[PDB]
Amino acid sequence: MFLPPPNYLFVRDVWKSNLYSEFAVIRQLVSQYNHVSISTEFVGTLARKVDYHYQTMRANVDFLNPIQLGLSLSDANGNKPDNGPSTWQFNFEFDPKKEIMSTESLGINFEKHENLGIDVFEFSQLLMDSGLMMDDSVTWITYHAAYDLGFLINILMNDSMPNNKEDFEWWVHQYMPNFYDLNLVYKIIQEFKNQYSLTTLADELGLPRFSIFTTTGGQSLLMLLSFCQLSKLSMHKFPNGTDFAKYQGVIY
């Protein structure tokens, strides 16, 4: 079974007021704690050849606004620093004046995001040169990632999403030259034995359903604990001796 130490189970909320001091912390940590996981959460509801899948994410990401973004840092073994936070939940500005659906119309403190939320443009500047991007010594961990990468890449580009899947893939590989989709790795592992959800993954590893994991910050924590535990068990190998790296850079 898997029982991460108590002090790892902590998510630091980031608002406009602490955005900079928290990035300073993230910059010191990245050389040693070079595995980073990401989770996102967006406001509305997605709107109506796996080119159909890409084309819908494209339009949606272009339109919709991410409201929270979760980052967690560990080393290759799931070790985290013993001082200060190593998981963050960035809370983004929310503007009801521009949001189509009313707040009253169909988990989140909308008022707070409105008064205290992060400017996505300031966020993207601090991420660009933080040490996390465009560097294959850093390992990105995602889960069922298309929309997360969609939203993250759109934030970094500060431009329209790419016309097609191939262009989108080009961009992801540049910003994130070393990344895994844990959803895919787990599914390939279960197929050497023939759900795939993260919680089902976490349970299968004997990880307690801590309450900390329910939030966006908490979900990036959970996928990072899981990826690392799972990778330690098998030594980064599939049941047939093949390396996980076989699926580096592949989405879904």
Binding site: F121, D129, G131
Partner: protein, 232 residues
């Protein structure tokens, strides 16, 4: 030569488990030969030729030689030397190259007496740095250079005449980089500050021209972006 503190520019170290050695006489001659004869045409052959003598333990020595003795004084050959680095395929070699470039710049930008700064060396090292980072879709880390905070500080310490031309030389290299050209938000945000300074600093014409020339390389003008509001 008296130095001043530089709050937002730092030199780190290259992470490397390998003992880095001065190259022995025989290795030198072999390398200088390649460097001296390589052209865009004979590039990939001169490179594999260079590999047979340049092993990771000599990377630091090569970087220290190429940056201090060649890049600093031969701007016409930056594209060539940059391609040699890429050709070598080593991420470690690239880090040494960047690190040595930061060392050279740190010393220059720290020099208290402007008159003692060789503006040609300064301009060449800034341009070289952009050459092997931004132009190659590789970032310059905030822990090494905090551009926006550097400019704001240069403003209150009256160091703009040195810092601006340095910044604009590096940023120029982003003009053909697919990730770093505008609307890259990192690049745009530095531009907005340059645009703010240009309006508020009441600085000299050569600086105004420097910013206009940078914007033009991105096909923008001082009216294409709203100025930041960091300066009082």
């Amino acid at each position: 030569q008296e130095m001043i503190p530089l709050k937002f520019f730092a030199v780190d170290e290259v992470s490397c488990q390998i003992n880095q050695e001065g190259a022995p006489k025989d290795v030198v001659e072999k390398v200088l030969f390649v460097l001296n004869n390589v052209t865009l045409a004979n590039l990939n052959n001169k490179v594999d030729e260079l590999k047979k003598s340049l092993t990771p333990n000599y990377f630091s020595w090569f970087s220290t030689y190429l940056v201090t003795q060649r890049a600093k004084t031969e701007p016409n050959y930056h594209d060539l030397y940059s391609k040699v680095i890429v050709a070598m395929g080593s991420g470690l070699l690239h880090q040494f190259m960047v690190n040595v470039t930061l060392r050279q710049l740190f010393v220059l930008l720290s020099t208290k007496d402007e008159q003692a700064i060789d503006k040609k060396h300064l301009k060449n090292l800034a341009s070289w740095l952009g050459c092997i980072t931004l132009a190659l879709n590789k970032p310059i880390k905030h822990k090494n250079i905090a551009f926006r905070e550097m400019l704001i500080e240069a403003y209150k310490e009256n160091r703009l005449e040195i810092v601006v031309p340095f910044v604009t030389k590096i940023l120029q290299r982003a003009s053909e980089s697919k990730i770093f050209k505008p609307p890259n938000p990192w690049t745009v945000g530095i531009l907005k500050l340059l645009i703010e300074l240009n309006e508020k600093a009441n600085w000299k014409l050569s600086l105004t021209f420097e910013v206009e020339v940078l914007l033009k390389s991105f096909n923008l003008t001082t009216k294409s972006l709203k100025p930041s509001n960091f300066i009082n």
